[PDB]
């Protein structure tokens with residue numbers, strides 16, 4: 001089983017990744033995890049991070065520019081992901097394709113049924129061949145307007161079943177229970 005943990009920064013996705021890892025392994029499962037963007041390895045991921053800190057002239061001013069950058073990062077790891085799914089019972093991804101839909105829709109003031117979110121699917125899953133996750137787990141916990149709104153879009157994706165089955169959880173979800181829901 002392949003699982004994206006999704007949510008906003010500061011939301012504490014990494015902690016939930018570690019939590020589920022323990023639980024899955026407690027349940028007798030081999031787990032691999034991997035996190036995006038892959039700063040330090042993907043030149044794309046790096047140029048995106050940099051473009052957001054002022055560098056690279058007018059790059060960050062284009063929503064589809066950034067999304068294309070974060071997409072190309074993930075696409076670069078497509079063979080590793082595919083390869084972890086052949087070697088482990090579970091592969092947990094901290095941020096994945098639905099990150100691009102939430103952050104783009106939010107910046108473009110669009111909703112889950114809109115163009116950005118549709119575009120992310122064509123590019124990342126269809127065109128670039130990234131595998132659809134079996135589950136996407138939104139960690140939804142209490143630029144701030146944009147961060148609120150991106151939070152809200154994520155949740156629109158959960159509600160629409162965008163990309164596949166989802167689950168929405170908060171800060172104190174029991175890991176054993178969530179693990180047993182997410183597993184066969």
Ligand SMILES: COc1cccc(-c2cc(-c3ccc(C(=O)O)cc3)c(C#N)c(=O)[nH]2)c1
Nearest residue numbers: 009036037063066067070095099100103104
């Ligand atoms: C800035 O404008 C745009 C425009 C379009 C897409 C995106 C966008 C953002 C991220 C992202 C990465 C790290 C963190 C963090 O840890 O704060 C937060 C968000 C991902 C990912 N992964 C992605 O795919 N797309 C951003």
